[PDB]
Design a protein around this ligand. Structure first.
Ligand SMILES: Nc1cc(CO)cc2ncn([C@@H]3O[C@H](COS(=O)(=O)NC(=O)[C@@H](N)Cc4ccc(O)cc4)[C@@H](O)[C@H]3O)c12
Ligand SMILES: Nc1cc(CO)cc2ncn([C@@H]3O[C@H](COS(=O)(=O)NC(=O)[C@@H](N)Cc4ccc(O)cc4)[C@@H](O)[C@H]3O)c12
Ligand code: NA
Ligand code: NA
Lengths: 413, 413
């Protein structure tokens, strides 16, 4: 059972009429969908959870539909959000829609026969729908009594300051109608998404019945709570660098790593169980984090992205910046380590103070005399030192390190 | 001051920023409006209360807009209604719109210069409004927290089985936008209606501030509760003479209770307040009910309708039917007196049975013999009598009275 496999990965929060849905999956290929609203330049890690689930369904022969909310992004999903969001402009939303559509596409196969993926956009049907048609044909099927009691919006109806507009209150009906549109258009019988989307999904199941007299299903994937109780890292490399992305996975807590392998990679459950059991009986610290980091970093940023993240990680730890490119240095200045902008000619002592690495020039004196300051890796032990011109690599980068762990990159101006 | 005068008639339930509206009315003509939704093929006496108020404003030099809800009648006003209403089709709503527009027109001056009345229909702007445009441009200004605290819908928001659909819940936004739309189109700065419409009116005052940065006002007229606790009008008394004959209409007013009649002159007539008060002084040994019936019947059904009602009332009181026309007997058949259809050749005994004036032929015989029965106002005491052909007036009508008061109209088949 595909559903059963997803359960042992931890990827099933809830599922409507599980026995019927499972019989439909065993019967043959179904079509399913997940929606993504455009609220930013790019998706982030959280979005991968249902997005990679679409691919898991496709790998079992089913047909995934990835919807971008061209219309619903002009409305705003309130589900489990504490505060009303400001409306975005049509112009901004459209540019975001195109970027998110192009981000989604490489994660699904658009060329594998009958079950090839489909890109969709609900603006196609909401852009020409009259309000009276929407109020009558769709709105009559919704009880405000039930709507105001849904978990996703209940808390917004406590105090009026942090209330909810009629605009965001109507969102649930737009996403409901989406399910009925994709049912009629492509035979979609399953919608998946995170557990916050449950109420938006069941509205689409019910409305699809009332409108199209068809039985469809929903399945939710979990929202991740870390083992310690906690929870942004974008897929766009110009927002989160491949090096920062890689390091984020490297620092995964021991109690989260195997679950995260299940959620964010396509490693078999057997290989994941073998890794956990190797980590268990080996008398060393876990190595799973390195496996997770390579896996997801290659997935999102490719082999080139992976090797650059490794190369930077290696040089930062070794002290040898000779391997690094200019582009490698640009990731460091974006994301990887704290940075400052100093005009050339400064001595190493005033380098430490201005970056908030050393408090005073007198403290920098003893710090530099104690052989505790590296410059691009090579020890420099004398206070009165100035940077040689060769040390400013690619004309604009030198990397300070106090002790072993404290970094600042100076981007000379 | 037009507002003070209306208050002396008891026609003002509530008013917003009253001092400010009063100064605005005193400065010069304003444009004002009232809306009427098509829920039947005719208006009834209730609608007269705000409709005649539109006229009262026009007589003071202001410009009335009478709006018929071609769009809101496709949605359904839930305010202070115990139960969800069934949706009406576009075809039948359009029928009602034109009948109601034609009913309303004679009550206002459409040809008196600058302040000529205007007929409006909110389908002209809602019939083609896109739903996203509606949810964004209008629905963002509406707090759901506030909507569910409107008195008009509180009784519907407690239990799903007596609940409210998203359809009827949104009605408040359409009426709110109407006000803003009429403000921009015509400079409308005032909306009137019954006190049941208060929440719909104040939502339009608010939205007009948000959309057009303009100050507008609202004034409501009371809902009439008769002095004996029962709600006014209750079936209903329709303006359409094919639903309520002018004779039935006139008798309704003739039989007003003395505790109501002076309140009803103020509400349903254009008599001066000074005259109404003078009439109430009667203690010299009341004309009020007759003045009320005369005024409103002339208003709604014209002089001809008034003379018809009086002519039938007198003929029924006197028993002499020679004044009644065939159209007059048709009013009687419609709703004036009990009627029964009978095949020609029935005898007097059977007519009395079939009309339920008598329970059996044996009893009818005695009753006839006792001289209790009139035929077209003439005594007939022969129990074995058959009607004469000349007693079928116009070939089709014969009026029976048993005793001094119990009528039944035979309509010969
Ligand atoms: N799964 C998951 C896990 C984590 C780690 O704990 C963080 C996440 N952050 C997000 N997600 C999940 O990503 C998906 C997209 O997110 S969204 O754009 O906000 N979606 C919406 O706003 C929908 N209303 C879009 C929609 C529009 C039209 C339609 O017809 C159907 C749907 C959702 O299924 C989230 O549950 C996360
Ligand atoms: N005043 C009064 C008194 C009595 C004696 O007790 C009985 C009455 N029965 C009715 N009324 C009054 O007649 C008017 C029409 O009634 S309605 O069609 O139901 N209206 C509606 O449904 C509005 N939503 C129409 C509307 C639409 C668009 C818009 O932009 C503005 C308004 C209302 O002002 C009632 O208060 C009565
Ligand atoms: Na989703
Ligand atoms: Na009204």
């Amino acid at each position: 059972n595909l559903i059963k496999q997803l359960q042992e990965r931890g990827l099933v929060a809830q599922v409507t009429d599980e026995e019927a849905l499972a019989e439909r999956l065993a019967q043959g290929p179904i079509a399913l969908y997940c929606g993504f609203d455009p609220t930013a330049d790019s998706l982030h890690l959280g979005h991968l959870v249902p997005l990679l689930c679409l691919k898991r369904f496709q790998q079992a022969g089913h047909k995934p539909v990835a919807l971008v909310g061209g219309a619903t992004g002009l409305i705003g999903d309130p589900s489990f959000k504490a505060a009303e969001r400001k409306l975005n402009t049509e112009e901004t939303v459209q540019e975001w829609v195109d970027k998110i559509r192009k981000q989604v596409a490489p994660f699904l196969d658009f060329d594998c026969g009958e079950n090839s993926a489909i890109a969709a956009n609900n603006y196609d049907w909401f852009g020409n729908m009259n309000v009276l048609t929407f109020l009558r044909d769709i709105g009559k099927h919704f009880s405000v009594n039930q709507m105001i009691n849904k978990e996703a919006v209940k808390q917004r109806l406590n105090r009026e300051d942090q209330g909810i507009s009629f605009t965001e209150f109507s969102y649930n009906l737009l996403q409901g109608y989406d399910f009925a549109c994709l049912n009629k258009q492509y035979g979609v019988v399953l919608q998946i998404g995170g557990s916050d989307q449950w109420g938006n999904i069941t509205s689409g199941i019910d409305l699809t019945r009332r409108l199209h007299q068809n039985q469809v299903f929903g399945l939710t994937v979990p929202l991740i709570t870390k083992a310690d109780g906690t929870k942004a890292v974008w897929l766009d490399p110009k927002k989160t660098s491949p090096y920062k992305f890689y390091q984020f996975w490297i620092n995964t807590a021991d109690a989260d790593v195997y679950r995260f392998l299940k959620f964010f990679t396509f490693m078999s459950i057997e290989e994941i169980n073998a890794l956990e059991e190797e980590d268990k009986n080996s008398g060393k610290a876990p190595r799973a984090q390195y496996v997770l980091a390579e896996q997801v970093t290659r997935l999102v940023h490719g082999e080139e992205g992976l090797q650059a993240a490794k190369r930077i990680t290696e040089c930062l730890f070794s002290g040898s910046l000779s391997a690094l490119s200019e582009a490698d240095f640009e990731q460091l200045a974006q994301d990887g380590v704290p940075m400052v902008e100093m005009e050339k000619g400064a001595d190493l002592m005033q380098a430490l103070v201005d970056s908030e690495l050393q408090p005073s020039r007198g403290q920098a004196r003893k710090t530099i005399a104690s052989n505790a300051i590296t410059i691009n890796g090579e020890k420099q032990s004398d206070p009165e030192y100035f940077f040689k011109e060769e040390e400013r690599l690619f004309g604009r980068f030198t990397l300070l390190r106090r002790g072993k762990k404290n970094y600042c990159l100076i981007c000379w101006k």
